[PDB]
């Protein structure tokens, strides 16, 4: 699998974030562990959350959870992150990643990431 991040890096303090990642090599609908992580000078790596591509359910970092949602559109093998109450503190490099963790196997796939300034 190959992961490519996208979306605008120029965000006003009054609007939302919308980042859509492309997935190539497998389907979103057949897997789990699709997730977002961000990197900022104040915090090396902060998990955001992941989505189950088979069931559509999600899990979020409790500290971010109150303002964040993750969803998919499997017809184009894409998924996205949306944050509503976006502020200066949310400036970070955002990454698209695939986390595979099962009894018989472990691996990650990371995209190159994008930068967002608020």
């Amino acid at each position: 699998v190959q992961l490519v991040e996208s979306g605008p890096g120029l965000v006003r303090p009054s609007e939302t974030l919308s980042l859509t990642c492309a997935v190539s090599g497998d389907s979103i609908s057949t897997n789990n562990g699709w997730s977002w992580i961000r990197q900022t000078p104040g915090k090396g790596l902060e998990w955001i959350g992941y989505i189950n591509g088979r069931s559509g359910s999600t899990r979020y970092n409790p500290s971010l959870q109150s303002r964040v949602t993750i969803s998919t559109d499997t017809s184009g093998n894409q998924f996205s992150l949306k944050v509503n109450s976006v502020t200066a503190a949310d400036t970070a490099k955002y990454y698209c990643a695939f986390f595979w963790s099962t009894y018989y196997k472990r691996f990650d796939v990371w995209g190159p990431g994008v930068r967002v300034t608020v």
């Binding site: 069931s55 359910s57 963790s101 099962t102 018989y104």
Partner: protein, 123 residues
Amino acid sequence: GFLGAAGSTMGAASMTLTVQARNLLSDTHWGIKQLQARVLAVEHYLRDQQLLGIWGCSGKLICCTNVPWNSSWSNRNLSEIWDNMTWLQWDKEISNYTQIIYGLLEESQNQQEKNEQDLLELD
């Protein structure tokens, strides 16, 4: 006592499951006939226990599962089934679907096991 609830409604009769459960275990020619009978009682007991284990139910008289109820098996109310019907009537009502339901119960448990192979929470 044993089968005392046979004429009771399903709801009322579900409270006597234990007494029924407890009554399942309790001249060459004659001796063979009796061994035949004892072995079979054991085999039947074990088959029911195995099915419950396969379906994910073990050590329970009442066990819930994830298989949806089909209106095609029986289109009735909860109040109708539990308050105005006995288990004998119910057993006849859906005897046509016994194997269908059992097949589905097994499939549901197998999916559950597959989901448990993930270390990821799957949320």
